Ligand binder design. Structure first.
Ligand SMILES: O=[N+]([O-])c1ccc(O[C@@H]2O[C@H](CO)[C@@H](O[C@@H]3O[C@H](CO)[C@@H](O[C@@H]4O[C@H](CO)[C@@H](O)[C@H](O)[C@@H]4O)[C@H](O)[C@@H]3O)[C@H](O)[C@@H]2F)c([N+](=O)[O-])c1
Ligand code: NA
Ligand code: ZN
Ligand code: ZN
Length: 376
């Protein structure tokens, strides 16, 4: 049966509209599992061509939601192209989401000593990147590349592949150049709206849903979420990002549930899709060799017991770095791998239990995502 949908892009493709409609329905029946770099990075994969994942090697199915970033789209594409892997994911009925770790438009010519010129260069660059600002052409080059990529992102029948495009995330912190010490709330909203407008109207992107994702609030109120919210005319997906402690984390898990509940209630009221766009044990704790072998079980149990938080469409965990990160090298991964270390520490069992849970949805559990009839 056709359902009526209201997207940021009133001219979005039918598959894009179908994706939205699919999540609207599915979200009250399951929570999909997402994973950054699902088929491009893994501790146990032997090909990064889009056909394998650590998730698959752990549980026998791929994540339903495949996360990537503009680090694979905008020059210099440090994370490498992903067109082929996105296409493989879409062909298996997966859902694609792309975040945006854009370089700093004010300082990107100064790259050399990390983090200068990157997302992590905290030099405020919002004011100088909006129209009238000296660095607006630099930001526009990024957006041009995102648009060209989207506009050519086609399946074997020549139809555009939908993508959930997540702009200027984690913006209630100040580690990025678009953060809260770097912009007034209005300036942040203008940056987000300008960017969406540029992609949709100036460049003609028709295969994006737009997500907004601040960090978790410890004072969980609608007013706090709304402070930097770009507005219902500009967002399709209401998310948030949260990273917690590996130990003594009950209060943190409660906060996860509270934030998920808030976005779920807001989403119902506003005609949006609520999600947890990033969640995980904080990287430093994993990098120190620490583990919580009940983490996934805690996550699913807490979320699905809550009548609001359970209504999220998906949650996504971060990348499984194949050789970790510079420490020597230290671990930096979120999906427990099918390997002796995760067998022995109990994390594999934890994840396998999460997979077995009736309420989680992996790629074979989602069907008919893109062929649902819709009205506007
Ligand atoms: O609480 N905080 O302060 C906080 C929380 C979360 C943050 O970031 C979010 O969490 C994940 C995991 O920590 C973080 O992961 C990084 O992701 C980036 C992008 O994929 C990786 O950086 C890239 O790595 C490749 C290869 O090394 C390079 O080619 C790229 O140029 C780029 O440097 C990085 O290694 C991590 O995996 C994400 O950033 C996510 F938003 C942050 N925070 O500062 O980011 C703080
Ligand atoms: Na759900
Ligand atoms: Zn239903
Ligand atoms: Zn994020």
């Amino acid at each position: 049966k056709p359902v009526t949908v209201k997207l940021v892009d009133s001219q979005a493709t039918m598959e894009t509209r179908s994706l939205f409609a699919f999540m609207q329905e599915q979200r009250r029946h399951s929570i999909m599992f997402g994973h950054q770099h699902e088929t491009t990075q893994g501790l146990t994969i032997t090909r990064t061509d889009g056909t394998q994942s650590d998730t698959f090697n752990a549980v026998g199915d791929f994540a339903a939601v495949y996360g990537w970033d503009t680090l694979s789209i905008v020059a210099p594409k440090a994370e490498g192209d992903i067109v082929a892997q996105v296409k493989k994911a879409y062909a298996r009925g997966g859902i694609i989401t792309v975040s945006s770790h854009f370089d700093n438009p004010k300082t990107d010519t100064q790259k050399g000593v990390w983090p200068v010129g990157t997302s992590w260069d905290q030099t405020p660059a919002v004011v100088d990147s909006l129209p009238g600002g000296a660095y607006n052409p630099v930001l526009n080059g990024y957006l041009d590349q995102v648009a060209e990529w989207a506009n050519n992102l086609k399946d074997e029948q020549g139809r555009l592949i939908p993508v959930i495009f997540r702009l200027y995330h984690a913006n209630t912190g100040s580690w990025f150049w678009w953060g809260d010490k770097q912009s007034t709330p209005e300036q942040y909203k203008q940056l987000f709206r300008y960017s969406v407008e540029y992609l949709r109207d100036v460049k003609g992107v028709r295969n994006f849903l737009y997500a907004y994702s601040p960090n978790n609030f410890w004072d969980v109120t609608e007013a706090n979420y709304l402070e930097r919210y770009p507005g219902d005319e500009w967002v399709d997906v209401l998310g948030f990002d949260t990273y917690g402690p590996v130990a003594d984390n009950a209060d943190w898990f409660r906060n996860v549930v509270a934030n998920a509940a808030l976005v779920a209630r807001m989403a119902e009221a506003r005609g949006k899709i609520p999600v947890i766009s990033e969640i995980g044990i904080r990287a430093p704790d994993i990098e120190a060799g620490l583990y919580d072998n009940q983490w996934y079980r805690k996550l699913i149990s807490g979320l699905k017991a809550d009548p609001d938080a359970r209504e999220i469409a998906f949650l996504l965990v971060w990348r499984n770095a194949p050789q970790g990160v510079p420490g020597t090298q230290v671990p930096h991964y979120w999906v427990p791998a099918n390997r002796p270390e995760n067998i022995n520490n109990g994390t594999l069992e934890d994840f396998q239990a999460f997979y077995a849970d009736e309420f989680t949805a992996f790629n074979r559990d989602i069907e008919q995502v893109y062929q649902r009839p819709t009205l506007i």
